[PDB]
Amino acid sequence: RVEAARNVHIVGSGDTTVVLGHGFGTDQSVWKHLVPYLVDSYRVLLYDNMGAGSTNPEYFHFERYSTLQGYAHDLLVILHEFNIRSCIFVGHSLSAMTGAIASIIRPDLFQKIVMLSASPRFLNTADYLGGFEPADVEQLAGAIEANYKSWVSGFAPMVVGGDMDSVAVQEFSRTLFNMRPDIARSVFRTIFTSDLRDYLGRVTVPCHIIQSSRDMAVPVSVAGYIHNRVGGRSVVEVMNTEGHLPQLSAPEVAIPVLLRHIKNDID
Ligand SMILES: Cc1c2ccocc-2oc1=O
Ligand code: NA
Ligand code: NA
Ligand code: NA
């Protein structure tokens, strides 16, 4: 059941639905410090993607999940099946891009996109700074197929930032361990070999572009890159936070920023 893989969950109520997408290695629980502050005003729809929960027996890695375009298509199917009208889409990490891709096809279904820790491409070119040289990609991949357990122990603190002991690193490690290792590797490869830069000018719905100032995976210049290239309205806010999952690791800072961008129009 594709429904089992997505694990769509709804909470809250209101005239507007907020759809929350998550990044690689985590799941919808990454939004645990945001949801309490939305449910009074919004219906909230959460879903799992990018291989999350694939240690569940009922999980099957459908063919559509071979590409980020397939995830974008699947998001559109979710919006259809849950009768979504003009959602506020909040995408962490690559789900910002699957949301953006989807919004080019059904802009009528998106009131806005709020991007958190988004990047259209991690690998550098001669002319584009994504934050990774080839050596960096190969070193981050590390033991992902040799020894999944070892890989997680190194990957999780690097991505989350701060220090290995933090609850956020523990949480990210927990969700990584709810991924089947083969799926983690294939999705990791999909992501690092995807290049979404060409889509940006086709995006027309308003984009609120939020990131940590100190994110190992997303140089500060990436927020500006997106801002300069999208085809509709946009705004940038770079937070004084570290790490790729600041909604989990620095909620005291990140949650009020997210709420302001959810609740208020540009501009
Ligand atoms: C694969 C991958 C990542 C690796 C490191 O940092 C953030 C990432 O987000 C992703 O989707
Ligand atoms: Na697949
Ligand atoms: Na379906
Ligand atoms: Na608004």
Numbering used by the authors: 3 to 269
Task: Reproduce the article's own wording on this structure.
A cavity was formed between the two domains, in common with other KAI2/D14 proteins reported12202122232425, and catalytic triad (Ser95-His246-Asp217) lied at the bottom of the cavity. Our results indicated a novel binding specificity in which ShKAI2iB bound karrikin but not SL, in agreement with the reported results of cross-species complementation assays of ShKAI2i.
To determine why ShKAI2iB exhibited a different binding specificity from KAI2 and D14s, we solved crystal structures of apo ShKAI2iB at 2.0-Å resolution and ShKAI2iB-KAR1 complex at 1.2-Å resolution. In the complex structure of ShKAI2iB-KAR1, KAR1 was embedded completely in the cavity, with the oxygen-bearing edge facing down, and thus, the carbonyl group of KAR1 pointing toward the bottom of the cavity. Carbonyl oxygen of KAR1 in the ShKAI2iB-KAR1 structure was able to form hydrogen bond with the hydroxyl group of Ser95 through a water molecule. This water molecule also formed hydrogen bonds with main-chain amide nitrogen atoms of Phe26 and Leu96, which acts as an oxyanion hole in catalytic activity of α/β hydrolase. On the other hand, the methyl group of KAR1 was embedded in the hydrophobic side consisting of Phe26, Leu142, Phe190, Ile193 and Phe194, and the pyran ring of KAR1 formed face-to-edge aromatic-dipole interactions and hydrophobic interactions with ShKAI2iB. As a result of inward shift of helix αD1, the side chain of Leu142 will cause a steric clash with KAR1 if it takes the same orientation as that in the KAI2-KAR1 structure. Unexpectedly, the complexed structure of ShKAI2iB with KAR1 also has a closed cavity, indicating that conformational changes of the cap domain are required to enable KAR1 to access the cavity. In the structure of KAR1-bound ShKAI2iB, the cavity was closed and KAR1 was unable to be exposed to the solvent.
